[PDB]
């Protein structure tokens, strides 16, 4: 035969992407602790 | 992760609210300026009484 075959295609993500808890967005934990510290200090200052 | 970010948003909102509340210190400066003008008057009356 000839020109008797078509083809589909699939896709893989990036390795650098890896997980979802990869800091800069997941380290919002540590940052939240910073923000809570900020909030406590501001509460005192406003008082 | 989403929950922590939401908590961070709420925290920064409250911090901003309180900071604005703190700023509304200016009423204290206004009052201190008023009391300063009064004390300037007290000083003038005292000087006159010395004479």
Curated annotation (Swiss-Prot), chain A:
Superkingdom, taxonomy of origin: Eukaryota
Family membership: Belongs to the syntaxin family.
Coiled-coil parts of chain: none
Job of this protein: Required for vesicle fusion with the plasma membrane.
Protein name in UniProt: Protein SSO1
Further remarks about this protein from its record: Present with 450 molecules/cell in log phase SD medium.
Compartments, record wording: Membrane
Stretch of the intact protein here: 166 to 212 of 290
Organism: Saccharomyces cerevisiae (strain ATCC 204508 / S288c) (Baker's yeast)
Swiss-Prot record, chain B:
UniProt domain t-SNARE coiled-coil homology: residue ranges: 2-51
Similarity comment: Belongs to the SNAP-25 family.
Entry protein name: Protein transport protein SEC9
Subunit composition and interactions: Interacts with SRO7 and SRO77.
Role summary: Component of a SNARE complex that may be the effector of SEC4 function in exocytosis.
Taxonomic superkingdom: Eukaryota
Gene that encodes the chain: SEC9
């Amino acid at each position: 035969d000839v020109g008797g075959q078509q083809i589909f295609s699939q896709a893989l993500l990036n390795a650098n992407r890896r997980g979802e808890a990869k800091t800069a967005l997941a380290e919002v934990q540590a940052r939240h602790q910073e923000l809570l510290k900020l909030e406590k200090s501001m509460a005192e200052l406003t008082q | 992760i989403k929950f922590t970010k939401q908590s961070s948003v709420a925290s920064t909102r409250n911090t901003l609210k309180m900071a604005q509340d703190a700023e509304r210190g200016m009423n204290t400066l206004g009052m201190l300026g008023h009391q300063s003008e009064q004390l300037n008057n007290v000083e003038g009356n005292l000087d006159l009484m010395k004479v």
